[PDB]
Design a protein around this nucleic acid. Structure first.
Lengths: 217, 51, 131, 99, 45
RNA sequence: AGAGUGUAGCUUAAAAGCACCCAACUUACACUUAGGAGAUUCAAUUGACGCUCUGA
């Protein structure tokens, strides 16, 4: 019973920019803001504006706008970052800074002499070695980059075996923090993929089920 | 039920009267016999009339 | 009664338990009261996040011993350039968890990472502290 | 000395005569109720989807553990062994704009 | 699922007004913080 | 290609009971007061459209 020892890892990426709000969610947020403004009890700005205006009117019959204009001009001068950094590039499929609202997953292309499978960042562990160590070595060597992969536990996430001589592809999870990639234009056709592109690219059934335990969001 | 819910639209519940004549007619034209048998059993009619 | 066959029918003390280390055996593993501090600047956001975490723990059959909240730290920062005051505040809420077994911790961590709000960090550690 | 900040300050006592009116209309109340019902349905659907995803993840992990125990009776303990890399667990949530 | 706990509400009765403030720290990122007064920008040095 | 099947999450129920959450009393949980989405997949005791396993 010669079982082929093989490993793998399902890389991930924490999101940065928040997700868009559904029109229903936007209406709910507006209603919540309205009810909060209605339930609030006075305010420093309101107390300093309304009472001051009333006193000025009373004195004339015998602050607020300045600060508002200052805030408006400060917000106009301060330019925020580009939130939609995907449509401007579109064709940049091999860039870590492509998608920011959804989760990203690594995607490497490898061609063999006997097969040409859409091989996910797989690995190969030694009987005397540990699966975690093998995954770390494959991430630090195959990707060729200094990354701070923050793992969670020593337990796996999904396994898929294939026979012809048995085998077994062991997967794992790893959350990045600061990935410093060297030479992005290398021969290694690495691509960053989320969910829709994952399901659209993955042709085989062994990897088609990998998306069952991935954060759909 | 779907037609009634669509016609009420939620706004009526936020206090309808609901008629009683139609309800009584439907009860008599469906599960009336069940309640009649229950009342007869409670009053003790089967244990005395037909023994 | 004792001799009668109906003995021990009204026994209820044996069902109620009217009376932390990190056990790590070979197969079973349980952490030692993990404290999840929800550091954030907004109070409503932190409260909602704590409520959601407690609801998830209750739905997944997870014990939640304590759930107190830490005091606020009035961090007074002087915006230098012109002296402009800005008395900010950092709120923190703790949520104790003990019921965990193998992949349950990973599932909970994944759920947390997937359901993160805007402007709320994390910092899990042991309970050994001084409030 | 646990001293929380949940007690209402004394400044919110006298100052309470600025917004005592809370008048609404029937159409506004109906719209609010409809929005609340829609948001409740959306939250229920989201919770159901999250529960389904959690169940799928649990099933996948159980299948992986079973395959490991079947094809490797000497690595199940190592896989179940919790590593000491979760004490300094610190992570920030998603912001709105990038650096 | 980041917008789940985003929609919240002040469960308390006595509380002052709260406006959406975009606080920018040294890292460079706006966070919807509910600070006193309607401040549109508050750069944190 | 074959087997297991066939009421939503569950039922030695045949359109009910336990699951769920949005608002008020809660640091928080729970209870309580207010509402809803919820299903015999179809065609005539049988045939096929939805999943699990065994293979290629």
């Amino acid at each position: 019973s010669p079982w082929r020892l093989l490993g793998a890892l399902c890389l991930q990426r924490p999101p940065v920019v928040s997700k868009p709000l559904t029109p229903l969610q936007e209406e709910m947020a507006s209603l919540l803001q309205q009810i909060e403004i209605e339930r609030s009890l006075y305010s420093d700005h309101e107390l300093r504006a309304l009472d001051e205006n009333q006193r000025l009117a009373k004195k004339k019959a015998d602050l607020a706008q300045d600060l508002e204009d200052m805030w408006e001009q400060k917000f106009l001068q301060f330019k925020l970052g580009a939130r939609i950094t995907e449509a401007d590039e579109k064709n940049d499929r091999t860039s870590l800074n492509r998608k920011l609202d959804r989760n990203l997953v690594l995607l490497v292309r490898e061609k063999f002499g006997d097969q040409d499978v859409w091989i996910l960042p797989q690995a190969e562990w030694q009987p005397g070695e540990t699966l975690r160590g093998t995954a770390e070595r494959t991430l630090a060597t195959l990707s060729e980059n200094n990354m701070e992969a923050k793992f969670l536990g020593n337990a796996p996430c999904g396994h898929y075996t294939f026979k012809f001589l048995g085998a077994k592809v062991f997967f794992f999870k790893a959350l990045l923090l600061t990935g410093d990639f060297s030479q992005a234009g290398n021969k290694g056709h690495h691509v960053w993929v989320t969910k829709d592109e994952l399901g659209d690219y993955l042709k085989p059934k062994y990897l088609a089920q990998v998306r069952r335990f991935v954060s759909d969001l | 039920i779907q037609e009634l819910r669509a016609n009420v639209e939620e706004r009526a519940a936020r206090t309808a009267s609901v008629p009683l004549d139609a309800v009584r007619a439907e009860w008599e034209r469906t599960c009336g016999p069940y309640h009649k048998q229950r009342l007869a059993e409670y009053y003790g009619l089967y244990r005395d009339l037909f023994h | 009664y004792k001799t009668k066959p109906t003995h021990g029918i009204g026994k209820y003390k044996h069902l109620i338990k009217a009376e932390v280390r990190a056990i790590n055996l070979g197969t079973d593993y349980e952490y030692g009261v993990l404290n999840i501090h929800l550091t954030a600047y907004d109070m409503t956001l932190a409260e909602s996040y704590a409520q959601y975490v407690h609801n998830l723990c209750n739905s997944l059959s997870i014990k939640v011993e304590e759930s107190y909240a830490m005091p606020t730290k009035t961090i007074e920062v002087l915006q230098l350039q012109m002296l402009l005051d800005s008395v900010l505040t950092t709120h923190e809420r703790v949520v104790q968890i003990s019921g965990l077994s193998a992949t349950f911790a990973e599932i909970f961590l994944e759920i947390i990472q997937s359901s993160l709000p805007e402007g709320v960090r994390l910092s899990v550690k042991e309970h050994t502290e001084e409030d | 000395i646990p001293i929380e900040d949940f007690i209402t300050p004394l400044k919110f006592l006298d100052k309470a005569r600025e917004r005592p009116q809370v008048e609404l209309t029937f159409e506004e109340t109906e719209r609010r109720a409809l929005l609340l019902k829609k948001w409740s349905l959306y939250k229920q659907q989201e919770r159901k989807m999250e529960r389904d995803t959690i169940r799928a993840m649990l099933e996948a992990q159980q299948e992986a553990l079973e395959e490991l125990q079947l094809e490797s009776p000497k690595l199940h303990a190592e896989a179940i062994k919790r590593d000491p890399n979760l004490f300094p667990f610190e992570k920030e949530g998603p912001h709105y704009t990038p650096p | 699922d980041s917008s789940r706990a985003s929609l919240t509400r002040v469960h308390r009765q006595a509380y002052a007004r709260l406006y959406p403030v975009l606080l920018v720290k040294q890292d460079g990122s706006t966070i919807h913080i509910r600070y006193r007064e309607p401040r549109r920008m508050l750069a944190m040095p």
